[PDB]
UniProtKB/Swiss-Prot annotation:
Residues 720-738 are annotated as: Activation loop. The gene is PIK3CG. It is found in: Cytoplasm; Cell membrane. The modification Phosphothreonine is found at residue 774. It is linked to Immunodeficiency 97 with autoinflammation: An autosomal recessive disorder with variable features. Affected individuals have childhood-onset antibody defects, cytopenias, and T lymphocytic pneumonitis and colitis. Some patients may have features of hemophagocytic lymphohistiocytosis. This is Phosphatidylinositol 4,5-bisphosphate 3-kinase catalytic subunit gamma isoform. Activated by both the alpha and the beta-gamma G proteins following stimulation of G protein-coupled receptors (GPCRs). Activation by GPCRs is assisted by the regulatory subunits (PIK3R5 or PIK3R6) leading to the translocation from the cytosol to the plasma membrane and to kinase activation. Inhibited by AS-604850 and AS-605240. The lineage of its organism: Eukaryota, Metazoa, Chordata, Craniata, Vertebrata. Phosphoinositide-3-kinase (PI3K) that phosphorylates PtdIns(4,5)P2 (Phosphatidylinositol 4,5-bisphosphate) to generate phosphatidylinositol 3,4,5-trisphosphate (PIP3). PIP3 plays a key role by recruiting PH domain-containing proteins to the membrane, including AKT1 and PDPK1, activating signaling cascades involved in cell growth, survival, proliferation, motility and morphology. Links G-protein coupled receptor activation to PIP3 production. Involved in immune, inflammatory and allergic responses. Modulates leukocyte chemotaxis to inflammatory sites and in response to chemoattractant agents. It comes from Homo sapiens.
């Protein structure tokens, strides 16, 4: 067709990358995976109920926590329904199915929410809708417009149409031809054979003078049999004088050993591991890039990779100990041989699977074969409750064997939609650790993407973000994105199209205003925004960070540039939907020069932390506001309404002095409060709020923060920001509990009011709570550093979280450690803020 020829052109511009392209391939793996995904794509579209997929209800099957019962009158919730303008309130029991909240209204139509693209459809108790649980949380009313179901019709999709390797015993070899750099020391080539960050054999070449061309024509023989190469092995070519690297999967997506001639353009190094370094893709920029030439031996060569007693006592106990230690504590050789010999005993403990499958010599045919027999007894893994920390450790950079990995992905299949949303950003980042383009995990992101409009909206932007600012991974991601778009359904396809149009204009607008860097500038911003508001910028569009919110007309009146070194737009929008209950605009900040990738990661851990605390019935009140990375150093940011920097509340009654007054904040609070009484709450909300960030900030190692980088709301709730900075470009304090926050709490100097005793008892139940998940957080945090924090890994950075979560110690030993922490705050007072000020305001 040709409606299959122009189509490919919209998809390509939705993606922001041309997949069909070929200038930076050296084989057909990607196309192979495009081919491949067609089936899981069509398998899920065919299989999703067009009804529920149309209204994408947002259900949750977890218990409605404590604080939200102790917030109900009694077994009675209230839901204001709206028609023409004739309102109406109704009684409803927390277990009231939605449709009944109509068979209880007429005694054809589906309940929507007011303002939002959020329906309350489907066979679920209301107790269990997120919006509801959201009203309950912040205490608002539940407003529905009884209106007409969307048309599945609109989600319809466009129309679609040898000698085995275990025979061969010769040490595997690769010939170097040499390298060549079109623009400039001695220099050697390093040729490692890797698997899952294990290094099997290793060779190099004689040094050389560093010249515009260098040739060796050597052969590097390895100490690895051909038959001992494991599926997922990388030839890793490197160049020292370290300067350039590049990789080649020795065994290919077709299970064939790689023989042939290869001209790979090679990746520079900026400035000890880091997810780009793992990539099977090659540098596109040829005119500039170093390159290396090799020969993989040939002939033929179709090859061809195919497919208990008892136990002492000190040993069992040595073994129980090993299973016990955290994900980061390293396995000695004594440890590994121990895990392996008693592997059948190690298989009974899912907790042992990461450590056990890392004791495997993947460079040995027979061992892998044995390991694969180990996976065939996987019944105890299979039965156990899903444990995401455990499931994550087998998906990291340490496991390169798709069988192992696949059983983690099997364990994810059983996450409810609610939880995919919690781990989606990092599961998507997890794709970078997959040796091959098509994977159980790449397919699982596809399935879940296609089965739910909310996961698929976020999957879209997460992937789109990576595509745009990572040339190491765009190819593979672009292929996954494309597969998504070919089956989300015209409707959303059209929606994604509005969103990309709008947010691509606002970006050049933003970069533009930045370039003109004042009275002479407030003018242009107001001027361009009219242009766009004229014809091109379509009427509305989903807010990318909040898929349920459609933004309508701008409001040039309120928009502006800002007094940052860089010049971020403070744009404000009208809600595009009439049914809205209020008239508060929608506020977004476009900014160039922050790596918002890091804020995404950090913000997302924060939500996971809010979710951990919920299992234990706490609520520490965080504001992990929306944030979407759209390109390199560029993206947008939700604006929390009614909030200021803490510094600003200092600049208020002191003003560019830094003579910080221990009292201004509790002042700012009353001034803003409607009463004294609600004001108590703006004190209460602060207590929790503050401890909440104190602990998470401390655990993540981003608690030693600057005063402009903390914020608060006229209604009490406090929250950090701009996490890009710190771990994004980087005499101390653990977190930040300033005399201001203390003063609000009732304490002064060496006194100890009650509210603060509370703050403490919160900082202690909360801090201990996260430690009940040491493993999960360590793996989240450890994957963040590798995939999101460039150059700042080393591992010595990764280990930090170990100390903070205080692995080893008992709860008692723990409750203390953190109160001592809280104490370094009370003892350091202002030294540091005042210190940061002397620094960040002048230096
Ligand atoms: C008004 N409320 C309000 N809400 C929010 C969420 C923000 C967020 C950022 C912000 C800035 C950079 C990175 C990130 C991502 O970590 C967030 C921000 O800079 N500001 C203001 C402080 C200086 C002027 C703008 C905010 N202000």
């Amino acid at each position: 067709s040709e409606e299959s020829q122009a189509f490919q052109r919209q998809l390509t511009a939705l993606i922001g990358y041309d997949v069909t392209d070929v200038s930076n391939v050296h084989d057909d793996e990607l196309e192979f995976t495009r081919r491949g995904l067609v089936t899981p794509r069509m398998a899920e579209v065919a299989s999703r109920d067009p009804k529920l997929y149309a209204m994408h209800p947002w259900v949750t099957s977890k218990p409605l926590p404590e604080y939200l019962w102790k917030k109900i009158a009694n077994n009675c919730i209230f839901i204001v329904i709206h028609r023409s303008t004739t309102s109406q309130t109704i009684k409803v029991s927390p277990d009231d199915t939605p449709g009944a909240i109509l068979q209880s209204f007429f005694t054809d139509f589906v309940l929507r929410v007011c303002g939002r693209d959020e329906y309350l459809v489907g066979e679920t108790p209301i107790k269990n809708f997120q919006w509801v649980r959201h009203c309950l949380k912040n205490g608002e009313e539940i407003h529905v417009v009884l209106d007409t179901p969307p048309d599945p019709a609109l989600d319809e999709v466009r129309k679609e149409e040898t000698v085995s390797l275990w025979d061969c015993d010769r040490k595997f070899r690769v010939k170097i031809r040499g390298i060549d750099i079109p623009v400039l020391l001695t220099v050697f080539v390093e040729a490692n054979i890797q698997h899952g960050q294990q290094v099997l054999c290793q060779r190099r070449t004689s040094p050389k003078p560093f010249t515009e061309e260098v040739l060796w024509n050597v052969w590097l023989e390895f100490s690895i049999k051909i038959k001992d190469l494991p599926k997922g092995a990388l030839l890793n070519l490197q160049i020292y004088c370290l300067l350039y690297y590049v990789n080649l999967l020795l065994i290919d997506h077709r299970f064939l050993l790689r023989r042939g001639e290869y001209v790979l353009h090679m990746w520079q190094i900026s400035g000890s591991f880091n997810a780009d370094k793992l990539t099977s893709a090659t540098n596109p920029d040829k005119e500039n890039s170093m390159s290396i030439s090799i020969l993989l031996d040939n002939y033929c060569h179709p090859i061809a990779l195919p497919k208990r007693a008892e136990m002492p006592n000190q040993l069992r106990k040595q073994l129980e100990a090993i299973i016990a230690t955290d994900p980061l504590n390293p396995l000695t050789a004594e440890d590994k041989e121990l895990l392996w010999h008693f592997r059948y005993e190690s298989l009974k403990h899912p907790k042992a699977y990461p450590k056990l499958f890392s004791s495997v010599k993947w460079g040995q045919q027979e061992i892998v074969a044995k390991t694969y027999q180990l996976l065939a007894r996987r019944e105890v893994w299979d039965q156990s409750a899903l444990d995401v920390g455990l499931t994550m450790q087998l998906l990291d950079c340490n496991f390169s064997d798709e069988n192992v990995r696949a059983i983690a992905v099997q364990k994810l299949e059983s996450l409810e939609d609610d939880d995919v949303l919690h781990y989606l950003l990092q599961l998507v980042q997890a794709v970078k650790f997959e040796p091959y383009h098509d994977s159980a995990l790449a397919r699982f992101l596809l399935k879940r993407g296609l089965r739910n409009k909310r996961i698929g909206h976020f999957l879209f932007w997460f992937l789109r973000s990576e595509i745009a600012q990572s040339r190491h991974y765009q190819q593979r991601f672009a292929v996954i994105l494309e597969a998504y778009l070919r089956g989300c359904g015209t409707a959303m396809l059209h929606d994604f199209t509005q969103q990309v149009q709008v947010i691509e204009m606002l970006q050049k607008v933003t970069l533009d205003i930045k370039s003109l860097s004042s009275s002479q500038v407030i003018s242009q911003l107001k001027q361009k925004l009219e242009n766009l508001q004229n014809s091109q910028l379509p009427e509305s569009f989903r807010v990318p960070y909040d898929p349920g919110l459609k933004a309508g007309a701008l409001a040039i009146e309120k928009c502006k540039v800002m007094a940052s070194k860089k010049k971020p737009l403070w744009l404000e929008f009208k809600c595009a939907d009439p049914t809205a209950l209020s008239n508060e605009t929608i506020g977004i900040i476009f900014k160039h020069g922050d790596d918002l990738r890091q804020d995404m990661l950090i913000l997302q851990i924060l939500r996971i932390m809010e979710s951990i605390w919920e299992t234990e019935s706490l609520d520490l009140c965080l504001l992990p506001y929306g944030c979407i990375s759209t390109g390199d150093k560029i993206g947008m940011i939700e604006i929390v309404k009614d909030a200021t920097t803490i510094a600003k509340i200092q600049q208020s009654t002191v003003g560019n002095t830094g003579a910080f007054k221990d009292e201004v904040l509790n002042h700012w609070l009353k001034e803003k409060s409607p009463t004294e009484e609600k004001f108590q709450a703006a004190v209460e909300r602060f207590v929790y709020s503050c401890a909440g960030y104190c602990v998470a900030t401390f655990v993540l190692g981003i608690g030693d923060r600057h005063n402009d980088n903390i914020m608060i709301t006229e209604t009490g709730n406090l929250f950090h920001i701009d996490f890009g900075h710190i771990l994004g470009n980087y005499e101390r304090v653990p977190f930040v509990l300033t005399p201001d926050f203390l003063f609000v709490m009732g304490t002064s100097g060496k006194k100890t009011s009650p509210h603060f005793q509370k703050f403490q008892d919160i900082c202690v139940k909360a801090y201990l709570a996260l430690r009940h998940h040491t493993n999960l957080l360590i793996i989240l945090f450890s994957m963040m550093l590798m995939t999101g924090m460039p150059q700042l890994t080393s591992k010595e950075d990764i280990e930090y979280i170990r100390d903070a979560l205080t692995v080893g110690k008992n709860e008692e030993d723990a409750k203390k450690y953190f109160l001592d922490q809280i104490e370094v705050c009370r003892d350091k007072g202002w030294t540091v803020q005042f210190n940061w000020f002397l620094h960040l305001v002048l230096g």
